[PDB]
Each structure stands twice: as structure tokens, then as C-alpha cells.
């Protein structure tokens, strides 16, 4: 399963809304997770099940699924949202990730 | 859980290396410990998973013959092994905890990476 | 038709009932640490148990033939608890480590009092071969058990032997058990289980117990010293220090009427129950 | 039937195989038995 | 039961000795065979016990490393062994039959010595 | 557990009553036996359970227990009662004996 992420870089001003897309090659049936990574740190879970936020994740992080397409929406962008985002499927093994999306301060 | 790995390693090609991950107990609930390789600048790649309780290993096709995943059940530590290192093996290596074979709801799989080691 | 009761649990012809309060039959008979009030119980006329008692099997598990045991209990008026195997009679096994946080006693972890949880001592579990001989002229109620562990690591951490058994044998009993080591859900914080078994030993019989692990050994048994016409009553009514000749789970009946509509379940000399609101026999003629 | 013996010595003295079974099978019956070798009380002079 | 032991032995220090006791069958009821040392003029001392069925031995702390208790389950005979005899080992030796783990009444143990060998 | 016997020698005329005492160091909870031994013979059981006589033991042999103290009473002493008596506890292992009591003809 190949997960293609869109876009690769996204320059959005803080306070606005950012939209990340992840498209699969096959059906993963909502078994998809969104992780966020800072430089030098391990990835940390934000979204599991393509909709459900983890504990501690604010309500401004929204995960949505439409068949094969998945969307992560970050509204009211704070200074700690500018990182690298990854979509990972766990419907099958081997587990595959996306190529990443860097969120840059405008 | 809280996973702690060994320190950074600098090696020459042709050497054998063993990194470790610990911090998991004998968790009664079925669980996987996975190894993840991340090249500098690139995304993440899943190398393989091991169940520490019965030493059952599932390897990625990209990493089946190159790395060896083992477990020492006495000290509760999962090892990743190379026999002959190469320049392409220079990357960050994480161990990730997730659950083995657990489901919920209408067939939703609960095996996302829930805990990573630095 | 009698329609009134005092709304209290009272003595039955002078004998005070055994009110188990928030304990069950299994919790009392196995020795729950929250049920230490019923360690020495006098002769009772009937047993009062609540509908959903809080203190039952503190460690999760089962009691085999529990309802048959309660049916047998509804024909017994008195027990005498006796130490059949002392806890100090286990020199090669550990008797003080067998405690659980699922079975608390004033905060600290504890266990059932009438049985002992035997653990390996000096990293060894010798094969228990224990016989008790009934020499008491009365039937004995003997309770034992088997622990079901979670994994092989726990099985070796508690008993050192991976594959174990418990064999029990009397003139009529022939039991062989093995632990069912499996992953289960947490009940009272514990994924492990404890299956308890009971038997009645006749006054000239032996119980032979042989096991190399997972054995919850008997320490105390119950001599059946009095029998005849008891019941187990599901009632939340409080004891009111009375005397009565007829008791129902909602109160005592003081009546010479032939009928009552109080409760179908009764003990003592009682009127006949009917689900009627009015039962009046005309004795005289009709009024102007 | 199945005989339940008293010890491993008697089990080898009668059948010579320490671990035995009886399997019975019909269109509706599927039975697997093992002996329960244990010490028991004497009934009619026999512990088995 | 009726226990019969081997004859008297006269030995020099540094020799190995094996006395025997027989007369017990494969008794179905659990049972112990014990060794008892009695010095001339003194009282009795319990050295150890063995179950002939499973070869389980309990040694006294005074006799744990000095004597060896064994059983030959084929001929139904319990042996007491010394590797290096001393002058202090000159005493009478009895084998005693009792029962293993049996209780009666209100916790009374039935393991008194019921049968001795000459 | 140390069993101290009293006295070590006792000279009583035949026909009279002899009293033997055995005191433990700890509690043995009535798991005590009394044995009698002749010169050259093995000890033979007289009393088990600190009160109960064995089969063949006459009723003149009496075993009594008072906590830690145990007493063997031989009334109407015959010529076959002048032997060595031992008290042995079997509450715990290692099993321990007393030092003995020789009964001498007066
Ligand atoms: C209950 O009945 C007894 C006789 O059985 C009688 O003495 C007593 O007064 C009765 N109680 C009431 C409240 O009538």
C-alpha cells in the first residue's frame, strides 16, 4: 500500500487553517493514523482510526475520511503546529507511511 | 509503556551491530514491538515486528534478509542486528510499541504505534 | 386474608437468623476478609442474603455447583468450623506470600481465610500429597481450589512447574484438574482466575489431595452439626430484634388468618399465600 | 468403560503404557477419555 | 508393614557404606521411610525421610551433607549412604515407617513412627 | 524444637505409680508420641496424640497434655515397665526426641 501525501510543503500564516491530504493505493478501511514529528524527536500520535483524536490532542485537530482519501485539518494554527506530519496505515502489514508534509510559518 | 533504547553508534562498513529496546514488561495483553528506520530527510519505513512473549517475528520484504530481530525474555529487551553494515544503513532507528491482533468496533484494528522509544 | 407485616427480620421461634449483611454464601464459606464477622456463627434458623452482595469471591473465579451447595445449605442449621490441615503444616511451601489486592483486608492485600494459596519456596514446589481422615461422626464440608494463571512466566514465577495438576479422591469423588493458562479480562484488577470446589466427607472417609502446582489448599472445614428446615432469603430488610413464627423477605407475620398476600416465600408456621387483595367470607346475612 | 488406576506402577503393571486414552466415535458421539490416576479411598476393597 | 534391614557393619574411617531397609510394598496411601540414628546411651536423632514412590527426600540440617538417602523402586528398598565414615558414625540405625501428610480430627497430624526395622 | 524429659532416672517399686514429664520449647499442639525401648530392641509405640494409646497398650498407661507440658503415667507397675521412655514430637520436621528416662526397679 502506497500512501501519497499532499502537499510536500505548506506555508500558512499562524491563526489560519491548514489542510493535509493522504491518498492510499488500495482500501485501508479507516485504519489510518496521523502522527506529528519535531526535529530530533520521535513521532507522536495525533489521530487514530482516521477520525479519533488521541488523549491530549486539542479539538482543533480534525481527522476525516472519504473512502481512500484522508484529510487532516488544523484550524487556528499555533506555533507548535509547524512540524512534519505523517499518515500511516495499519490495515495490513507491512505498515507504510507517507512521505511527510512540512508546515512552515508564513 | 515507556521505551528506552541504546545510545548512538558510529560504525564502519562490514561490522556487526546490535541495538536494543526495553521498557516493556511481560504485558499479559498481546503486543508487538516494531523497528522503524527513518533516513535523514525522508519518511519512515517499517522494518519488522516481534512478539517478545513467544519470539514470533514478522519481517518486511525490504528488510527480511538484511536485519535480524530477536528478544531476550529474561531481561525483557528486543534487539535489532546487522551482520555487515553499509553506508545506506545510516538512519535513525525507533522501537515502537503497539498491540497484537486487537480489534474494536466494526472491525477497526487497534495496532497503531502507541509508544515510541527515543 | 392477612395484609400486614411488621416489616422487620425477626427471630424464628427463639433462634436468631444468620444475616450475612453484604456477604454472600461463597464469601462466608470461603472466608472473605471483608466477612470476618461470620468466622464463628451460632445456630441459625434461616440465612439472609442480599440480592446483590458486594463481598463474594474477592479474587475473580467461580464456585462449582454453587447453587447445589446453597440448596444443601437450606437444610443445615449449624456449622462447626474446624482446622483440618493447619497452615503451619506446610514446611516446604510458602504460606505467607499467597495474598491478593483483589482480596483486601483493611487496605493491605489478603486472601480467603479458610483456604491457603500455596507458593513455591526456595524456587521449588514439591508434590503435595495430603490426606485428611474424617473422625468426627459428622459430615464435613471441604472446600479447595485451583488457580488459573495468566502466562507461562507467571506460572513459573508462582509455582516453578509449567504443567501442573490437582487430583482429589474420596470414596465417591475422582477429580483431576489442570490450570487454564490464558489471557482474560481484568475483574477486580486481576486477569487470573480461581475455581473453587466443595465436597462432603462422610464420617469414616478420606480426601486425598495430590498436586504439583496451582493448589488452593483447604485449611478449615465445616462439621454439619445440625440439620433440618432452613432457607436462604433474599432480603434487604433490617433485623428488628423480634420473635415470630412466620417470616417473609419483607417482614414477619403475626396472624391466625388462613391466608396472606405478603410474599410467596415464607419460613415457619404460616398462612397460605394467595395473590388476592380481598378475601372475606360472609358469615351473617345481608344488611339493609 | 475406562479403568482409573491408583499409581504409575499399577498403570504399567496392567497396561505398560503410562499415558493412555480411549476415543469413541459414532455419527453423534465424539468421546475422548484419559485415566485419572490418583489415590482414593477403598470401596469394596478397591482404590481404583 | 514389617521392616527388615541389613546386618551389622564394621568399617574403618574413610570408607563408604550403604545400609538398606525393605518390607514396604508400593503402598497406595502416601508414606515416609525415615532413618533414625541412636548413639549408645544417648537418645534418638532423626536423620531424614524419603518417599519411595517419587524419591522425594527431606534431610535434617544436622545430616544434610553427611548422609545420602536413596530408593530403588524396582526392588522396594531404601538405602542410607556414607561416603567417608568417621568414628562418630558408630551408632545403631533404624528405619521407621510413617505416613506422609495425613491428618485427622481437628488438625492432628498422623505421622508418628508406626513401624520400625530392627 | 527441644524436648526436655524429667527425670533422667526414676527408681519406683513395682506396683506403685510412675510419672514421666516432657516439656517442649515451642508449641507442638498435641502432636506428641511416647515410645518405650528395651535394651537391644527398637522403640515401640505406646502413646500417640499425647493421649491416645496404641493397640495392645493396657489402660494403666495414661497420656495427658497441658499446653507445652506432657505427662506419661504408669500405674500398677509390672516387671515389663522398667525400660527407657522417649517423647517424640511430629508437629514439625525435623522430628526431635527427648533424652530418655530409665525406669529402675526399687
Ligand atoms: C403477636 O402475637 C402474639 C401471640 O403470638 C401476641 O402476644 C402479640 O400481642 C402480637 N402482637 C401484636 C402487635 O398484636
mmCIF file of N, CA and C in Angstrom, chain B residues 1-102:
data_model
loop_
_atom_site.group_PDB
_atom_site.id
_atom_site.type_symbol
_atom_site.label_atom_id
_atom_site.label_comp_id
_atom_site.label_asym_id
_atom_site.label_seq_id
_atom_site.Cartn_x
_atom_site.Cartn_y
_atom_site.Cartn_z
ATOM 1 N N UNK B 1 3.260 2.360 28.330
ATOM 2 C CA UNK B 1 4.632 1.898 28.491
ATOM 3 C C UNK B 1 5.598 3.012 28.102
ATOM 4 N N UNK B 2 6.880 2.816 28.406
ATOM 5 C CA UNK B 2 7.903 3.814 28.107
ATOM 6 C C UNK B 2 9.131 3.083 27.590
ATOM 7 N N UNK B 3 9.443 3.267 26.311
ATOM 8 C CA UNK B 3 10.536 2.549 25.671
ATOM 9 C C UNK B 3 11.811 3.380 25.699
ATOM 10 N N UNK B 4 12.911 2.742 26.089
ATOM 11 C CA UNK B 4 14.237 3.343 26.125
ATOM 12 C C UNK B 4 15.167 2.477 25.287
ATOM 13 N N UNK B 5 15.923 3.109 24.393
ATOM 14 C CA UNK B 5 16.840 2.398 23.520
ATOM 15 C C UNK B 5 18.283 2.702 23.901
ATOM 16 N N UNK B 6 19.201 2.002 23.240
ATOM 17 C CA UNK B 6 20.620 2.219 23.458
ATOM 18 C C UNK B 6 21.066 3.525 22.801
ATOM 19 N N UNK B 7 22.316 3.892 23.056
ATOM 20 C CA UNK B 7 22.860 5.132 22.547
ATOM 21 C C UNK B 7 23.196 5.058 21.069
ATOM 22 N N UNK B 8 23.638 6.197 20.544
ATOM 23 C CA UNK B 8 24.023 6.298 19.145
ATOM 24 C C UNK B 8 25.296 5.504 18.877
ATOM 25 N N UNK B 9 25.393 4.968 17.664
ATOM 26 C CA UNK B 9 26.511 4.124 17.273
ATOM 27 C C UNK B 9 27.121 4.639 15.978
ATOM 28 N N UNK B 10 28.451 4.685 15.937
ATOM 29 C CA UNK B 10 29.202 5.039 14.740
ATOM 30 C C UNK B 10 30.062 3.842 14.363
ATOM 31 N N UNK B 11 29.847 3.315 13.161
ATOM 32 C CA UNK B 11 30.496 2.086 12.731
ATOM 33 C C UNK B 11 30.975 2.234 11.295
ATOM 34 N N UNK B 12 31.902 1.355 10.917
ATOM 35 C CA UNK B 12 32.447 1.243 9.577
ATOM 36 C C UNK B 12 31.768 0.097 8.834
ATOM 37 N N UNK B 13 31.707 0.148 7.488
ATOM 38 C CA UNK B 13 31.085 -0.949 6.728
ATOM 39 C C UNK B 13 31.745 -2.303 6.951
ATOM 40 N N UNK B 14 30.928 -3.350 7.057
ATOM 41 C CA UNK B 14 31.409 -4.691 7.324
ATOM 42 C C UNK B 14 31.348 -5.114 8.775
ATOM 43 N N UNK B 15 30.898 -4.246 9.674
ATOM 44 C CA UNK B 15 30.808 -4.576 11.088
ATOM 45 C C UNK B 15 29.398 -5.044 11.446
ATOM 46 N N UNK B 16 29.292 -5.696 12.599
ATOM 47 C CA UNK B 16 28.028 -6.195 13.120
ATOM 48 C C UNK B 16 27.565 -5.291 14.253
ATOM 49 N N UNK B 17 26.268 -4.989 14.280
ATOM 50 C CA UNK B 17 25.713 -4.054 15.254
ATOM 51 C C UNK B 17 24.458 -4.635 15.884
ATOM 52 N N UNK B 18 24.255 -4.327 17.165
ATOM 53 C CA UNK B 18 23.075 -4.754 17.918
ATOM 54 C C UNK B 18 22.557 -3.569 18.724
ATOM 55 N N UNK B 19 21.420 -3.010 18.311
ATOM 56 C CA UNK B 19 20.747 -2.026 19.150
ATOM 57 C C UNK B 19 19.633 -2.705 19.936
ATOM 58 N N UNK B 20 19.231 -2.073 21.033
ATOM 59 C CA UNK B 20 18.309 -2.678 21.981
ATOM 60 C C UNK B 20 17.149 -1.735 22.266
ATOM 61 N N UNK B 21 16.063 -2.321 22.760
ATOM 62 C CA UNK B 21 14.900 -1.580 23.224
ATOM 63 C C UNK B 21 14.319 -2.309 24.424
ATOM 64 N N UNK B 22 14.035 -1.566 25.489
ATOM 65 C CA UNK B 22 13.455 -2.143 26.691
ATOM 66 C C UNK B 22 12.486 -1.137 27.288
ATOM 67 N N UNK B 23 11.729 -1.587 28.279
ATOM 68 C CA UNK B 23 10.754 -0.723 28.912
ATOM 69 C C UNK B 23 9.375 -1.338 28.915
ATOM 70 N N UNK B 24 9.236 -2.458 28.220
ATOM 71 C CA UNK B 24 8.015 -3.247 28.232
ATOM 72 C C UNK B 24 8.174 -4.369 29.246
ATOM 73 N N UNK B 25 7.119 -4.620 30.011
ATOM 74 C CA UNK B 25 7.124 -5.732 30.942
ATOM 75 C C UNK B 25 6.661 -6.993 30.220
ATOM 76 N N UNK B 26 6.385 -8.041 30.990
ATOM 77 C CA UNK B 26 5.612 -9.156 30.461
ATOM 78 C C UNK B 26 4.154 -8.719 30.474
ATOM 79 N N UNK B 27 3.784 -7.865 29.515
ATOM 80 C CA UNK B 27 2.373 -7.407 29.412
ATOM 81 C C UNK B 27 1.482 -8.603 29.065
ATOM 82 N N UNK B 28 0.479 -8.883 29.903
ATOM 83 C CA UNK B 28 -0.430 -10.038 29.672
ATOM 84 C C UNK B 28 -1.152 -9.875 28.331
ATOM 85 N N UNK B 29 -1.633 -8.664 28.032
ATOM 86 C CA UNK B 29 -2.313 -8.392 26.737
ATOM 87 C C UNK B 29 -1.314 -8.588 25.590
ATOM 88 N N UNK B 30 -1.740 -9.236 24.500
ATOM 89 C CA UNK B 30 -0.848 -9.496 23.340
ATOM 90 C C UNK B 30 -0.310 -8.167 22.797
ATOM 91 N N UNK B 31 0.979 -8.124 22.442
ATOM 92 C CA UNK B 31 1.582 -6.841 21.989
ATOM 93 C C UNK B 31 2.743 -7.061 21.011
ATOM 94 N N UNK B 32 3.007 -6.066 20.161
ATOM 95 C CA UNK B 32 4.106 -6.110 19.209
ATOM 96 C C UNK B 32 5.114 -5.028 19.572
ATOM 97 N N UNK B 33 6.394 -5.320 19.361
ATOM 98 C CA UNK B 33 7.448 -4.310 19.347
ATOM 99 C C UNK B 33 8.012 -4.264 17.934
ATOM 100 N N UNK B 34 7.971 -3.092 17.313
ATOM 101 C CA UNK B 34 8.390 -2.917 15.933
ATOM 102 C C UNK B 34 9.634 -2.046 15.847
ATOM 103 N N UNK B 35 10.387 -2.248 14.773
ATOM 104 C CA UNK B 35 11.546 -1.429 14.452
ATOM 105 C C UNK B 35 11.222 -0.564 13.245
ATOM 106 N N UNK B 36 11.547 0.721 13.340
ATOM 107 C CA UNK B 36 11.248 1.699 12.302
ATOM 108 C C UNK B 36 12.541 2.418 11.942
ATOM 109 N N UNK B 37 12.848 2.463 10.652
ATOM 110 C CA UNK B 37 14.009 3.163 10.122
ATOM 111 C C UNK B 37 13.567 4.459 9.460
ATOM 112 N N UNK B 38 14.210 5.564 9.827
ATOM 113 C CA UNK B 38 13.925 6.861 9.224
ATOM 114 C C UNK B 38 15.230 7.460 8.723
ATOM 115 N N UNK B 39 15.365 7.559 7.408
ATOM 116 C CA UNK B 39 16.512 8.206 6.802
ATOM 117 C C UNK B 39 16.432 9.715 7.030
ATOM 118 N N UNK B 40 17.584 10.404 7.110
ATOM 119 C CA UNK B 40 17.560 11.866 7.271
ATOM 120 C C UNK B 40 16.893 12.589 6.113
ATOM 121 N N UNK B 41 15.771 13.247 6.394
ATOM 122 C CA UNK B 41 15.050 13.999 5.387
ATOM 123 C C UNK B 41 13.886 13.245 4.779
ATOM 124 N N UNK B 42 13.960 11.917 4.785
ATOM 125 C CA UNK B 42 12.918 11.094 4.197
ATOM 126 C C UNK B 42 11.868 10.722 5.243
ATOM 127 N N UNK B 43 10.892 9.927 4.813
ATOM 128 C CA UNK B 43 9.841 9.468 5.699
ATOM 129 C C UNK B 43 10.243 8.249 6.504
ATOM 130 N N UNK B 44 9.260 7.507 7.005
ATOM 131 C CA UNK B 44 9.510 6.372 7.881
ATOM 132 C C UNK B 44 9.269 5.076 7.124
ATOM 133 N N UNK B 45 10.019 4.045 7.504
ATOM 134 C CA UNK B 45 9.925 2.725 6.895
ATOM 135 C C UNK B 45 9.837 1.690 8.004
ATOM 136 N N UNK B 46 8.842 0.815 7.920
ATOM 137 C CA UNK B 46 8.680 -0.242 8.909
ATOM 138 C C UNK B 46 9.533 -1.445 8.525
ATOM 139 N N UNK B 47 10.426 -1.851 9.427
ATOM 140 C CA UNK B 47 11.327 -2.972 9.179
ATOM 141 C C UNK B 47 10.773 -4.313 9.633
ATOM 142 N N UNK B 48 10.151 -4.377 10.801
ATOM 143 C CA UNK B 48 9.639 -5.650 11.272
ATOM 144 C C UNK B 48 9.081 -5.522 12.670
ATOM 145 N N UNK B 49 8.438 -6.602 13.106
ATOM 146 C CA UNK B 49 7.784 -6.648 14.405
ATOM 147 C C UNK B 49 8.081 -7.980 15.071
ATOM 148 N N UNK B 50 8.123 -7.964 16.399
ATOM 149 C CA UNK B 50 8.357 -9.171 17.182
ATOM 150 C C UNK B 50 7.405 -9.167 18.371
ATOM 151 N N UNK B 51 6.892 -10.348 18.709
ATOM 152 C CA UNK B 51 6.174 -10.523 19.958
ATOM 153 C C UNK B 51 7.181 -11.043 20.970
ATOM 154 N N UNK B 52 7.479 -10.303 22.040
ATOM 155 C CA UNK B 52 8.501 -10.750 22.997
ATOM 156 C C UNK B 52 8.131 -12.002 23.780
ATOM 157 N N UNK B 53 6.840 -12.332 23.850
ATOM 158 C CA UNK B 53 6.399 -13.451 24.677
ATOM 159 C C UNK B 53 6.740 -14.798 24.042
ATOM 160 N N UNK B 54 6.540 -14.930 22.730
ATOM 161 C CA UNK B 54 6.784 -16.196 22.048
ATOM 162 C C UNK B 54 7.847 -16.117 20.959
ATOM 163 N N UNK B 55 8.521 -14.969 20.819
ATOM 164 C CA UNK B 55 9.581 -14.742 19.826
ATOM 165 C C UNK B 55 9.102 -15.001 18.400
ATOM 166 N N UNK B 56 7.891 -14.551 18.089
ATOM 167 C CA UNK B 56 7.360 -14.609 16.734
ATOM 168 C C UNK B 56 7.666 -13.298 16.026
ATOM 169 N N UNK B 57 8.289 -13.389 14.854
ATOM 170 C CA UNK B 57 8.778 -12.226 14.125
ATOM 171 C C UNK B 57 8.105 -12.174 12.762
ATOM 172 N N UNK B 58 7.655 -10.983 12.375
ATOM 173 C CA UNK B 58 7.213 -10.703 11.014
ATOM 174 C C UNK B 58 8.146 -9.660 10.418
ATOM 175 N N UNK B 59 8.786 -10.004 9.308
ATOM 176 C CA UNK B 59 9.740 -9.131 8.641
ATOM 177 C C UNK B 59 9.097 -8.453 7.441
ATOM 178 N N UNK B 60 9.495 -7.214 7.210
ATOM 179 C CA UNK B 60 9.156 -6.565 5.954
ATOM 180 C C UNK B 60 9.915 -7.238 4.811
ATOM 181 N N UNK B 61 9.330 -7.297 3.613
ATOM 182 C CA UNK B 61 10.079 -7.822 2.456
ATOM 183 C C UNK B 61 11.326 -7.019 2.116
ATOM 184 N N UNK B 62 11.353 -5.725 2.440
ATOM 185 C CA UNK B 62 12.541 -4.915 2.202
ATOM 186 C C UNK B 62 13.643 -5.176 3.222
ATOM 187 N N UNK B 63 13.314 -5.758 4.374
ATOM 188 C CA UNK B 63 14.274 -5.949 5.452
ATOM 189 C C UNK B 63 14.389 -7.394 5.919
ATOM 190 N N UNK B 64 13.920 -8.364 5.128
ATOM 191 C CA UNK B 64 13.823 -9.740 5.610
ATOM 192 C C UNK B 64 15.196 -10.375 5.795
ATOM 193 N N UNK B 65 16.062 -10.252 4.795
ATOM 194 C CA UNK B 65 17.376 -10.851 4.838
ATOM 195 C C UNK B 65 18.499 -9.956 5.307
ATOM 196 N N UNK B 66 18.216 -8.696 5.629
ATOM 197 C CA UNK B 66 19.249 -7.732 5.989
ATOM 198 C C UNK B 66 19.398 -7.542 7.492
ATOM 199 N N UNK B 67 18.295 -7.522 8.235
ATOM 200 C CA UNK B 67 18.331 -7.307 9.674
ATOM 201 C C UNK B 67 17.766 -8.538 10.368
ATOM 202 N N UNK B 68 18.096 -8.664 11.649
ATOM 203 C CA UNK B 68 17.608 -9.760 12.478
ATOM 204 C C UNK B 68 17.007 -9.179 13.749
ATOM 205 N N UNK B 69 15.759 -9.520 14.030
ATOM 206 C CA UNK B 69 15.075 -9.057 15.230
ATOM 207 C C UNK B 69 14.973 -10.219 16.206
ATOM 208 N N UNK B 70 15.450 -10.002 17.429
ATOM 209 C CA UNK B 70 15.444 -11.037 18.450
ATOM 210 C C UNK B 70 14.939 -10.448 19.757
ATOM 211 N N UNK B 71 14.748 -11.312 20.750
ATOM 212 C CA UNK B 71 14.309 -10.883 22.071
ATOM 213 C C UNK B 71 14.998 -11.737 23.128
ATOM 214 N N UNK B 72 15.364 -11.099 24.235
ATOM 215 C CA UNK B 72 15.858 -11.778 25.428
ATOM 216 C C UNK B 72 14.738 -11.689 26.460
ATOM 217 N N UNK B 73 14.030 -12.804 26.654
ATOM 218 C CA UNK B 73 12.853 -12.813 27.512
ATOM 219 C C UNK B 73 13.195 -12.693 28.991
ATOM 220 N N UNK B 74 14.446 -12.944 29.374
ATOM 221 C CA UNK B 74 14.867 -12.837 30.767
ATOM 222 C C UNK B 74 14.996 -11.386 31.218
ATOM 223 N N UNK B 75 15.547 -10.523 30.364
ATOM 224 C CA UNK B 75 15.773 -9.126 30.710
ATOM 225 C C UNK B 75 14.775 -8.197 30.026
ATOM 226 N N UNK B 76 13.842 -8.751 29.246
ATOM 227 C CA UNK B 76 12.777 -8.016 28.556
ATOM 228 C C UNK B 76 13.347 -6.936 27.636
ATOM 229 N N UNK B 77 14.085 -7.384 26.623
ATOM 230 C CA UNK B 77 14.778 -6.482 25.717
ATOM 231 C C UNK B 77 14.765 -7.049 24.302
ATOM 232 N N UNK B 78 14.342 -6.220 23.351
ATOM 233 C CA UNK B 78 14.262 -6.578 21.940
ATOM 234 C C UNK B 78 15.473 -5.997 21.222
ATOM 235 N N UNK B 79 16.149 -6.840 20.444
ATOM 236 C CA UNK B 79 17.381 -6.476 19.761
ATOM 237 C C UNK B 79 17.172 -6.430 18.254
ATOM 238 N N UNK B 80 17.833 -5.462 17.625
ATOM 239 C CA UNK B 80 17.954 -5.358 16.177
ATOM 240 C C UNK B 80 19.418 -5.539 15.790
ATOM 241 N N UNK B 81 19.667 -6.418 14.818
ATOM 242 C CA UNK B 81 21.007 -6.886 14.494
ATOM 243 C C UNK B 81 21.309 -6.709 13.015
ATOM 244 N N UNK B 82 22.493 -6.175 12.726
ATOM 245 C CA UNK B 82 23.107 -6.252 11.407
ATOM 246 C C UNK B 82 24.382 -7.077 11.488
ATOM 247 N N UNK B 83 24.621 -7.872 10.446
ATOM 248 C CA UNK B 83 25.852 -8.647 10.332
ATOM 249 C C UNK B 83 26.936 -7.879 9.582
ATOM 250 N N UNK B 84 26.584 -7.275 8.449
ATOM 251 C CA UNK B 84 27.516 -6.491 7.640
ATOM 252 C C UNK B 84 26.858 -5.148 7.338
ATOM 253 N N UNK B 85 27.272 -4.111 8.063
ATOM 254 C CA UNK B 85 26.698 -2.780 7.894
ATOM 255 C C UNK B 85 27.135 -2.147 6.580
ATOM 256 N N UNK B 86 26.327 -1.222 6.068
ATOM 257 C CA UNK B 86 26.638 -0.493 4.848
ATOM 258 C C UNK B 86 26.402 0.988 5.100
ATOM 259 N N UNK B 87 26.780 1.818 4.128
ATOM 260 C CA UNK B 87 26.591 3.261 4.232
ATOM 261 C C UNK B 87 25.116 3.633 4.149
ATOM 262 N N UNK B 88 24.307 2.765 3.538
ATOM 263 C CA UNK B 88 22.882 3.047 3.394
ATOM 264 C C UNK B 88 22.125 2.775 4.691
ATOM 265 N N UNK B 89 22.794 2.195 5.686
ATOM 266 C CA UNK B 89 22.153 1.879 6.956
ATOM 267 C C UNK B 89 22.219 3.053 7.926
ATOM 268 N N UNK B 90 22.807 4.167 7.497
ATOM 269 C CA UNK B 90 22.916 5.350 8.344
ATOM 270 C C UNK B 90 21.560 6.044 8.394
ATOM 271 N N UNK B 91 20.833 5.847 9.491
ATOM 272 C CA UNK B 91 19.500 6.411 9.668
ATOM 273 C C UNK B 91 19.165 6.364 11.151
ATOM 274 N N UNK B 92 18.075 7.034 11.520
ATOM 275 C CA UNK B 92 17.561 6.971 12.881
ATOM 276 C C UNK B 92 16.707 5.717 13.026
ATOM 277 N N UNK B 93 16.785 5.075 14.187
ATOM 278 C CA UNK B 93 16.089 3.819 14.424
ATOM 279 C C UNK B 93 15.231 3.948 15.674
ATOM 280 N N UNK B 94 13.940 3.687 15.526
ATOM 281 C CA UNK B 94 12.986 3.749 16.620
ATOM 282 C C UNK B 94 12.423 2.363 16.904
ATOM 283 N N UNK B 95 12.124 2.109 18.170
ATOM 284 C CA UNK B 95 11.301 0.971 18.544
ATOM 285 C C UNK B 95 9.934 1.478 18.978
ATOM 286 N N UNK B 96 8.893 0.836 18.466
ATOM 287 C CA UNK B 96 7.530 1.292 18.687
ATOM 288 C C UNK B 96 6.709 0.172 19.303
ATOM 289 N N UNK B 97 5.927 0.523 20.313
ATOM 290 C CA UNK B 97 5.020 -0.410 20.957
ATOM 291 C C UNK B 97 3.650 -0.299 20.308
ATOM 292 N N UNK B 98 3.061 -1.438 19.955
ATOM 293 C CA UNK B 98 1.647 -1.450 19.613
ATOM 294 C C UNK B 98 1.062 -2.774 20.069
ATOM 295 N N UNK B 99 -0.224 -2.962 19.813
ATOM 296 C CA UNK B 99 -0.920 -4.145 20.293
ATOM 297 C C UNK B 99 -1.072 -5.190 19.199
ATOM 298 N N UNK B 100 -1.098 -6.455 19.611
ATOM 299 C CA UNK B 100 -1.110 -7.587 18.691
ATOM 300 C C UNK B 100 -2.530 -8.109 18.528
ATOM 301 N N UNK B 101 -3.060 -7.996 17.313
ATOM 302 C CA UNK B 101 -4.306 -8.637 16.948
ATOM 303 C C UNK B 101 -5.546 -8.106 17.622
ATOM 304 N N UNK B 102 -5.503 -6.913 18.204
ATOM 305 C CA UNK B 102 -6.673 -6.390 18.889
ATOM 306 C C UNK B 102 -7.570 -5.628 17.926
#
